[PDB]
């Protein structure tokens, strides 16, 4: 009876850890690129590490100061919006 | 008690499904890549052998000790999550 | 008169939907390319930064004056239509 | 009352221009390539600007005289059929 | 006899559908490639002009005599099956 | 009456040959690659002729003796499992 309660307790735990592993493995990546140049309208041209250059939007939370040519950026994989500026 | 045994069956069933899901996510074929650098928040930049660079998540069962620049890694193909460090 | 006001509501609704459709089509992310040459019928050959060359349509709101060989352009990703000339 | 009629008139106009813009942005591109060689059966081998070489059909409206090696051609994007010979 | 004529209509119908299916599978556009080598079991290794190498099947109507290393071939795009040897 | 029976006979034949041609043209290819290195767990790292390196499974029927670096291998096109070792 306390045996069960224990099993319920470790099962809950194992299940929580497995869910977490699922969440981590399923989370979408971001795509790395380099800022090529900033446009008069606040859209940025990025060179994707996939090859092409794109005109993309930028996260409202990004300090636009940090967006300058040569800056390494991380892009949403579908919309290619700048999500982070990277070191 | 009948309730506990029921809860144990349920959680075991849940566990079973979670394990199968983690196994699929971790299963081959996996894309090979190379760790490029590690971010303060614990996400990793990897270069995939397909060419581009990504910011990715990692399995919680990786040995962080081996997880460093130049390390060869095995990536889930859909998300590019780091599933194993390789030699 | 009741008919006119109705017709205005209708046409305004239609206008609204058309504006949203044009905005999506013109919205980022856009692929960067370079005008290669201009055809007698007014279609343009562009080289996309993805590599290949295409014969494409153009937005009617482009300034034809800037639309010339070597001009950097912003392309709809699906159709490769020229949406903006860039500097 | 003449106010409405006017609004109906400019709305019709604006809506026509927007439709046109939609039509232009949605129209499919053609893919540029170069004629590599002509086959005994009237199928042409084309080098796509996307990289590979293909055996393709030609439009019935094309003067087959103009199809010779080195000729720049424009291809339907799905079937890769020669739609135009370009300057 | 009524049964025979019926069986002939049926088999002719079947034939018709089969012929159409073979024509689609053999129809342009076809990818160009180069035979790389021939395997004991009669499957062929081809290099596609898209880059990679494949082990593929072949049409039964190919002249085996022309089917040899360096031979230029025409590949079904979906399966990469050898549909024609080209000059 | 024997005329029909004959037509039924050749139709059956033609139909069998056409089916066969369909089967050959529809059969999936295998993708060529080169064994890069063998892993402690029996998963192999293969360099695909498509470019990237992958961690893949191997057919239970493959003599694992033959799997060594530089070995040319043929891969299932979806799972990238080693199906054959090639000369």
Curated annotation (Swiss-Prot), chains A, B, C, D, E, F:
Signal peptide: none annotated. It is found in: Cytoplasm. Homohexamer. The hexameric complex has a two-ring architecture resembling a top hat that caps the 20S proteasome core at one or both ends. Upon ATP-binding, the C-terminus of PAN interacts with the alpha-rings of the proteasome core by binding to the intersubunit pockets. Belongs to the AAA ATPase family. ATPase which is responsible for recognizing, binding, unfolding and translocation of substrate proteins into the archaeal 20S proteasome core particle. Is essential for opening the gate of the 20S proteasome via an interaction with its C-terminus, thereby allowing substrate entry and access to the site of proteolysis. Thus, the C-termini of the proteasomal ATPase function like a 'key in a lock' to induce gate opening and therefore regulate proteolysis. Consists of three main regions, an N-terminal coiled-coil domain that may assist in substrate recognition, an interdomain involved in PAN hexamerization, and a C-terminal ATPase domain of the AAA type. This is Proteasome-activating nucleotidase. The lineage of its organism: Archaea, Methanobacteriati, Methanobacteriota, Archaeoglobi, Archaeoglobales. The chain holds residues 57 to 120 of 398 of the full protein.
């Amino acid at each position: 009876m306390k045996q069960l309660e224990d099993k319920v307790e470790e099962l809950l735990s194992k299940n929580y850890h497995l869910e977490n592993e699922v969440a981590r493995l399923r989370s979408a990546p971001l795509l790395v690129g380099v800022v090529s140049d900033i446009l008069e309208d606040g859209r940025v041209v990025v060179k994707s590490s996939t090859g092409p250059k794109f005109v993309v939007n930028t996260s409202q939370y990004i300090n636009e100061e940090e967006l300058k040519p040569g800056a390494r950026v991380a892009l949403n994989q579908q919309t290619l919006a700048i999500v982070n500026v990277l070191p």
